Specification:
The record marks 37 as: Facilitates cleavage of polynucleotide substrates. The active site is at 16 (proton acceptor), 123 (proton donor). The record marks 2, 14 as: Important for bactericidal activity, bacterial agglutination activity and binding to bacterial lipopolysaccharide (LPS). The record marks 39 as: Critical for catalytic activity. Substrate binds at residues 39-43, 64, 83. The chain is 22% helix and 34% strand. By secondary structure, it is an alpha+beta fold. It has one domain: P-30 Protein (Roll), CATH 3.10.130.10. The strands form two sheets. A four-stranded antiparallel β-sheet has the order 2-3-6-7. A hairpin with an 8-residue loop joins strand 2 and strand 3 (70-72). The longest helix is centred in the first third of the chain and has 12 residues, at 24-35. The radius of gyration is 15 Å and the shape is globular. The structure holds adenosine monophosphate.
Length: 128
């Protein structure tokens, strides 16, 4: 199980960080259990947390919400997009779709239970 409250960066890793591609239905059961509903969609970045956190130190750019703490990866990355096809919670079923895209993440200061990097990724801002 996960604690009563994880940090935003830790939830970002649980939700979007799977360096090895896996099965959607398998990898979604944890997230849907923490949310108590079948998540309609989620993107898995096939990269190490160390790699995605390193994007936080590249040039800061604008986000969708017009905040300015977003950073774009310098290179495309492998991804799998899970899509809720059927099933009632907790029996959520998904279809997988591979992608090779750039990503933009929003970063913020580490919270006191996160690793002490200058910045940590907390939100998958966009795929492009
Ligand atoms: N543009 C943004 N800049 C900074 N933090 C954000 C941004 N969008 C979402 N967040 C944070 O990311 C968390 C949720 O992200 P997510 O679950 O990926 O939607 C919350 O703690 C938000 O405050």
């Amino acid at each position: 199980m996960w604690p009563k409250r994880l940090t935003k960066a830790h939830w970002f890793e649980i939700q979007h960080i799977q360096p090895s591609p896996l099965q959607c239905n398998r990898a979604m059961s944890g997230i849907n259990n923490y949310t108590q509903h079948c998540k309609h969609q989620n993107t898995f970045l096939h990269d190490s947390f160390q790699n995605v956190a390193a994007v936080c130190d590249l040039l800061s750019i604008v986000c969708k919400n017009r905040r300015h703490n977003c950073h774009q990866s310098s290179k495309p990355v492998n991804m799998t997009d899970c899509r809720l096809t059927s099933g009632k919670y907790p029996q959520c079923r998904y279809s997988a779709a591979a992608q090779y895209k750039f990503f933009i993440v929003a970063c913020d200061p580490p919270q006191k239970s996160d690793p002490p990097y200058k910045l940590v990724p907390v939100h998958l801002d966009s795929i492009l």
